[PDB]
Ligand binder design. Sequence first.
Ligand SMILES: Nc1ncnc2c1ncn2[C@@H]1O[C@H](COP(=O)(O)OP(=O)(O)O)[C@@H](O)[C@H]1O
Ligand SMILES: Nc1ncnc2c1ncn2[C@@H]1O[C@H](COP(=O)(O)OP(=O)(O)O)[C@@H](O)[C@H]1O
Ligand SMILES: Nc1ncnc2c1ncn2[C@@H]1O[C@H](COP(=O)(O)OP(=O)(O)O)[C@@H](O)[C@H]1O
Lengths: 493, 742
Amino acid sequence: NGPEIMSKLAGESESNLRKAFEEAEKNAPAIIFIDELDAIAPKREKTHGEVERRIVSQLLTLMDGLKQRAHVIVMAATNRPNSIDPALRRFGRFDREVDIGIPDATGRLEILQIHTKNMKLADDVDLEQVANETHGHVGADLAALCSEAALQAIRKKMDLIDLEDETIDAEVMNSLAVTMDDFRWALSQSNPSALRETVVEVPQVTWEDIGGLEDVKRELQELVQYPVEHPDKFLKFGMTPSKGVLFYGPPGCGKTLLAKAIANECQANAISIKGPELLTMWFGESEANVREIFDKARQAAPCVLFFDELDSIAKARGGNIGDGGGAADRVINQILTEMDGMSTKKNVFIIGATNRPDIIDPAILRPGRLDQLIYIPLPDEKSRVAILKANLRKSPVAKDVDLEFLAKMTNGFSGADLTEICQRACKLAIRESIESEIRRERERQTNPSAMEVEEDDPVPEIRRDHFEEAMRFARRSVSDNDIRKYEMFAQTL
Amino acid sequence: NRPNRLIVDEAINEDNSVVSLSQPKMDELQLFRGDTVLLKGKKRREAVCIVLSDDTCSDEKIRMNRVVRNNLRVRLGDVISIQPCPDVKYGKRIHVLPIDDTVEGITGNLFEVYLKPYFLEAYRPIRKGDIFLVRGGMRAVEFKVVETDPSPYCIVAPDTVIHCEGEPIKREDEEESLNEVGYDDIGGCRKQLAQIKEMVELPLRHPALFKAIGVKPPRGILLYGPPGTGKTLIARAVANETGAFFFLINGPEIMSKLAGESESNLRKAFEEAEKNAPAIIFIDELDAIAPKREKTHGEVERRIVSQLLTLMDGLKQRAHVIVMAATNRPNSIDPALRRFGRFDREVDIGIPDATGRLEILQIHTKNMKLADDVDLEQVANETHGHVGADLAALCSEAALQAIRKKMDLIDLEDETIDAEVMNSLAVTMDDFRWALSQSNPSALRETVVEVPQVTWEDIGGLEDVKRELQELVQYPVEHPDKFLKFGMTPSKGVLFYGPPGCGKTLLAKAIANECQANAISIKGPELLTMWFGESEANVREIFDKARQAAPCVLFFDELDSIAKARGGNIGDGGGAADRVINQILTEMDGMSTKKNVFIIGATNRPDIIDPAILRPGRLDQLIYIPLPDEKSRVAILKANLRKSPVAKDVDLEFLAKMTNGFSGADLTEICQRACKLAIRESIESEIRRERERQTNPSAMEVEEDDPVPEIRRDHFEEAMRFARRSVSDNDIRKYEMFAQTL
Ligand SMILES: Nc1ncnc2c1ncn2[C@@H]1O[C@H](COP(=O)(O)OP(=O)(O)O)[C@@H](O)[C@H]1O
Ligand SMILES: Nc1ncnc2c1ncn2[C@@H]1O[C@H](COP(=O)(O)OP(=O)(O)O)[C@@H](O)[C@H]1O
Ligand SMILES: Nc1ncnc2c1ncn2[C@@H]1O[C@H](COP(=O)(O)OP(=O)(O)O)[C@@H](O)[C@H]1O
């Protein structure tokens, strides 16, 4: 333990370290584990005391001497690779490195299973929902949640039941069960999520979620699936697969969904970086972090890297006319620098997205960088019906509706608009249900009828009335001038 | 289950020896409010009390105060036995006697003040050995009845001769003096107090349980807040109210020594706490011991933190010792302590509100004699920014003024000042006003969180907006299952756009008042300060507060201020994006819906707002606030004028009709101007009347009549001359065009 070594004098600490190494040697096959390594050996810039520098050299000498003697293995735990000295990350001391990352929904569900073995649970546990809503937590957080959820129920029940009846015994102790309401309380009242950094995981979106764009599906598969599956075919001929693609098109056309659909289809990690992050880098003048991103993509291969709002920086410093200057800026320069110095064999695809390709710096469209450009057009009637069906496959609906009629009645729309229409219809339905239920509850309370239940779902499903009402506020979002501009850019190429 | 026993719990009444039962229990115990009842208690002792009836208390919970609990030795959560005693028999001069080695300012005849008023009009039941307490002369003295002529207990009657002895018999060692603090000595921190009570009630009153189950209790708690908020007070109160051994550590005491002595003292403290388990350790001035390594340079400073970390790690293995630490802000200390197993649990004390300040004043004004002009509500309203220490200092200074003025003149030569003249002095509100105006180093200028007092009836009109806001805010919290049945996830975030002075700021507080949720407001000057200082990190802290004050409402006004600073609508060479809005979007995107933290923005120039903040997942519902109309203007006038005296000759409807395209601010200004004219006229008339008759030596001439208690149409019509429109019709056209072009 780091603090135990740092809570002593030079002689005692540097004797304990050597004694520990000797005892590890004596009892082979032995594994030494070190934690809080940064507490012992940070970068020399942060070290001032002479004893602090004297304690690192001893560790370096011990690591160097380890290779000659015994089968002792050494493992160390740190928060980040760059928090410690760089002399340890050499050939012979700490060559091998590993990342633990974060658990996913399956991992969180597994952790809950591990922590709920000996506890008694009811039939409303549905741990899948808890795993879904448990975002940002880690193993310790899940353990704390389970303990607190158990504590609520036990404290409320026992104090009333047994504080005077009799000395609580095992039977009454284990008679108590647990309920999902306790879990909800412990997860809402106590939600100290200890994670706000990036995330890497395989998404869940599928091709069925997408509406249309089948040719784009084929063109993306040819780019991504073929190189990984069949390298010998490329070897026989002379072409090397190009990594990097750029989507350009009107907003709200499903650009963000394809980047995750491809990863789900190929079962590969995915990383998404939004425009506000880029603007934060620009304002803070913190370009080094870009490197870290690629490092992660290097250690999560195969993986897909996604960039959206790529024209945000150009928009910030003036519009199409722009401020006095050129297309180049700092962050795109660093991105190009990182892209050029990357090996093809690592299998890290790069995807960019935009709706104003004209003001993009042309240097990123050159060969060796993003060079394949794909246009995402507005959905058509055949596609629009697919979007409506895809979004409405998760809510109860009636049969009087005419989805095709709504599809034909819409022209020059986006998926976002139809999603908003569905959300508004659902809002109307829930408001009507709330009003009806509250009125029913209030009317009969005055009448002292101890038994009066005409229980019927007032509106379990929606009808054409709400949908046609929502059609009043529904209107176009993208101007036809924008579509003309997009077509002009797609033709002038 | 042998319904003879019953739990004990807190009482609201100030008087002694009164137990309040739960009403549904009348005929099961068979005793009414006119019957005294015997309650059993540990080490074979008892008491007898009269009973009251109330509704709010729970069935199994008697309510009884500290004085009647201590002699029973009963500690809250413990169970005692209740049995009726209609066989009560009066006594003849029970012998009563002061306790303790000595009493401050004690001499002469204390019985005519500390006994007879208390027993009078009371018929208080009393058992031999009881410690019933009396209060007066701004001191709390408790008198133990040593002998009762009949036995076991007696009613006190006005026909009992009284026995004036006044001997200091020292208190027995075993009982814990009533001097100690309790839950009744703290006010304004009820929520966090309940949190701590429920968190640490089981491990101390039920450790055998925790060894009967496999679960991990907390073994470290942090409390952060400004100084003088009652942290060590809370820790000591919790320790006293559970019987757990209490240990105290002071940071400067450790830092005022050498390495060997300091790092010994820490370990000996930990071992001593271990020995006396179940025990609680309290640490204050933690930042003085373990700040972030950036601010630490001495090697011993870094060595003293590793010892604490090792001790914290080893604590989990041994005994039931709990550890609590106090700090000013969470970020001032090392991040290595805020891990799983050392200081996982964190709490904020915040600041008291008007109710909290009033409660603190009540706590600090118990033994002081006060007049009939106190109206502490006004003082609490005007006491903005003060904390418990400030209120204590204010009360002490207010008492000091009067005592120093009066006593020096009265008694410096008459005689050695005695108790009678000491306590004869009262206190007067003018002294409070002086002590509150002259000495006002309020120790608070930071943000504030509290439930506002504004209500719907304050707002004039906008009923549809009220309904549409209720649908957004009330429904998700009240009825989630209905959202679960369907597929819609409530959208959190709304934007008000409209002309200035239309009541935008009032709705954000009216909603919070209706829902009884906290509220936070950040004004444009703060945003501009962050912009100029390039301090964006502060934004994060704000959201953290909202996370720890949930459910809560967040408000932002003058959101277009930055866009206005760097040029106007045309603007300087650049785009709509800036730094602070980028950080706000970053914080909004990374926040969970279940936390129930709504966000409200307000503006009058929505055109120059960055479109990126209007996208789905962010502020997406836009509401227009139009100018008040005649029906709304009459309501605004009535709402504003419901606080000032007015005559009846006015025609409010006529004024409302005569105004077109006005704002609430304009009407409030009209009312203020009319009030100013009225007060000026009253002052002039009063001064002229006072000066005219002073020359005429008429000793008795008082035609006392309020010259103008209420205002008439004359002043209002005079104010009509300066009253004029504020918002141009062109701005109205612009707003309507923006509302139609959507
Ligand atoms: N091809 C599509 N199939 C299904 N849904 C779509 C499609 N295109 C857009 N959407 C809808 O748009 C929303 C997401 O928009 P997004 O793709 O992020 O916009 P952008 O393409 O500008 O990033 C989703 O709720 C989705 O329902
Ligand atoms: N919530 C409170 N209620 C009543 N008195 C308080 C409260 N908070 C502080 N005080 C007053 O402050 C004094 C103790 O201050 P203390 O809490 O020890 O300062 P710190 O907050 O630095 O620990 C007491 O005399 C007490 O009257
Ligand atoms: N609907 C309303 N009902 C009552 N008073 C109002 C209303 N609208 C504005 N006011 C008056 O306006 C004043 C506050 O203006 P405010 O709402 O802060 O302006 P803004 O909306 O530009 O922030 C208050 O004194 C209040 O009397």
